[PDB]
Write a structure and sequence with these properties.
The structure is a homodimer. Chain A is mainly β. The first copy, chain A, is built from one helix and 19 strands. Chain A folds into two domains: about 120 residues, Thrombin, subunit H; about 60 residues, no CATH class. In chain A, strands 6, 7, 10, 11, 12 and 19 form a six-stranded mixed sheet that branches. Chain A is globular. Chains A and B meet through strand 12 and strand 18 of A and strand 12, helix 2 and strand 18 of B. The structure holds 2',5'-GpAp. 2',5'-GpAp sits at the interface of chains A and B.
Chain lengths: ~190, ~200
C-alpha cells in the first residue's frame, strides 16, 4: 500500500484487508513501542504519565477498544500528526484529545500491543454513564428482581461501555435483547 | 441457605440470589486480600505479585477472572475456605497446579478488584493458538484465507452451533478471548496475561 498509516474513515474500509487495526488508524506494519516513557510529536519530547484509560474508535463497521497511555501537554496536538519514540520510530498517529483547561491538554497514545485491546465486530460502541446499580444487555435495573422479570419477558448486536464519573469501565455486549458478555475492566475511561 | 457454595449444584436457586465469583456463589460481597496474605487451614501464605486469567463454568454461564497467584509447598483441598488476615472469608479453594514434587500454585480471586468477565449462556473452551489470526471458531494464516471464509459464510452459512467462547494462549501466555456465534465473529479481547491451569 502507498498509505502506511491512515486514520479511520468510512471510505477506507478496504484497508481492513491490508492493514492492521490500531485504535483510530490503520497501519501497514507493526508499529514500535514507547521507549522510556517519552513520545515525540512535531520535534518536541513529551514525558508519558503512568496513567492509562480506555479509548475507542469506530472504523465504520467495527469498534476498536484500547487501553492507552495518557500524555499531559501544555500544547495542542494536530490530529493525524505522526508520533515517534526516542529511537525515531513511528508509534502511531495523533487521535482526538481532551482540553483540560485553557493551557492543558491530555492525549491518549496506544503503546503497541502491550495493553488491553478489544476488537468488536459489526458494532458501533455506545459510551454512557451508569445510572443504576445493575447493567444487563442494553438495559439497566435497580435490583435482581427487576432483572429476572426482564429476562423472563425477553434486534441486532450492540456494545455499551459503561462508566461512573469516567471510572470502572464496564463493557457489555448484547444481541436481540440477550446479554452476551459483561466485562468489568477496572480501568478509567478517556474523554 | 448456603451463603458460599462452589459451582456444580442447585444453580437455579443460587443464580438469582448470589453473586457470581469465579468458581463459587456468595450471598454477600466477599472481603479482599489484605497485605498480600491469604490464610488456608490456619496457615498464612504470602500472595505473589503475579496474576493469571482463570475461568469457571457453573453449568450455563462462564465466569472469566484475573486471579492472583499463591505459591505453596502444601496442597490445598478443593472447597477449603480462604480467609484474609482479619479472619474474613475471601473465597473457596479452587483447582490448582503442581509445579514440582514439593511445589503447588493456586489462583485466588481478590474480590472484584481485577478483571472480571461474565459470559452468559456459554461454555468456554481453552485452546493453544496455532495460527496468526483468530476469527469466529477458526484460525487463519493470513487475511486472504480469512476473507475467503468471510465471503463463503456470507454466501452460505450452515453453522447453527450457537454462541461460543474460546480462550487462546501461546504456551500459557497472551490470553486472548474470542466470542463468536453461528460462524460469526463478535469480539476479540487481548488480555495480555498468562492463562492459569493445566493447559
Ligand atoms: N491490531 C492488533 N491489536 C492488538 O492489540 C494485537 N495483539 C495481538 N495482535 C495480533 O498481531 C497479529 C499481527 O501481527 C494479529 O493477527 C493479532 O492476532 P489476532 O488478534 O488473533 O488477529 C485478529 C485479526 O483479524 C483482523 N480482522 C478482524 N475482522 C476482520 C475483517 N472483516 N477483515 C479483515 N481482517 C479482520 C483483525 O483486524 C486482526 O488483524 P489486524 O489487526 O492485523 O487487522 C494484535 N493485533
Amino acid at each position: 500500500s502507498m498509505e502506511s498509516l491512515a486514520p479511520f474513515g468510512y471510505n477506507k474500509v478496504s484497508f481492513k484487508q491490508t492493514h492492521h487495526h490500531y485504535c483510530g488508524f490503520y497501519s501497514l506494519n507493526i508499529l514500535a513501542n514507547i521507549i522510556d516513557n517519552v513520545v515525540v510529536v512535531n520535534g518536541k519530547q513529551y514525558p508519558v504519565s503512568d496513567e492509562t484509560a480506555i479509548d475507542w474508535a469506530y472504523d465504520g463497521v467495527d469498534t476498536i477498544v484500547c487501553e492507552k497511555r495518557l500524555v499531559y501537554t501544555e500544547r495542542e496536538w494536530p490530529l493525524h500528526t505522526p508520533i515517534y519514540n526516542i529511537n525515531n520510530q513511528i508509534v502511531g498517529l495523533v487521535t482526538h484529545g481532551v482540553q483540560l483547561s485553557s493551557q492543558e491538554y491530555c492525549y491518549a497514545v496506544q503503546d503497541g500491543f502491550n495493553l488491553y485491546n478489544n476488537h468488536l465486530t459489526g458494532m458501533n460502541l455506545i459510551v454512557r454513564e451508569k445510572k443504576k446499580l445493575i447493567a444487563y444487555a442494553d438495559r439497566e435495573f435497580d435490583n435482581k428482581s427487576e432483572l429476572q422479570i426482564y429476562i423472563e419477558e425477553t434486534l441486532g448486536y450492540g456494545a455499551i461501555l459503561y462508566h461512573v464519573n469516567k471510572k470502572n469501565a464496564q463493557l457489555i455486549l448484547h444481541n436481540n435483547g440477550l446479554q452476551i458478555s459483561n466485562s468489568r475492566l477496572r480501568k478509567n475511561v478517556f474523554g
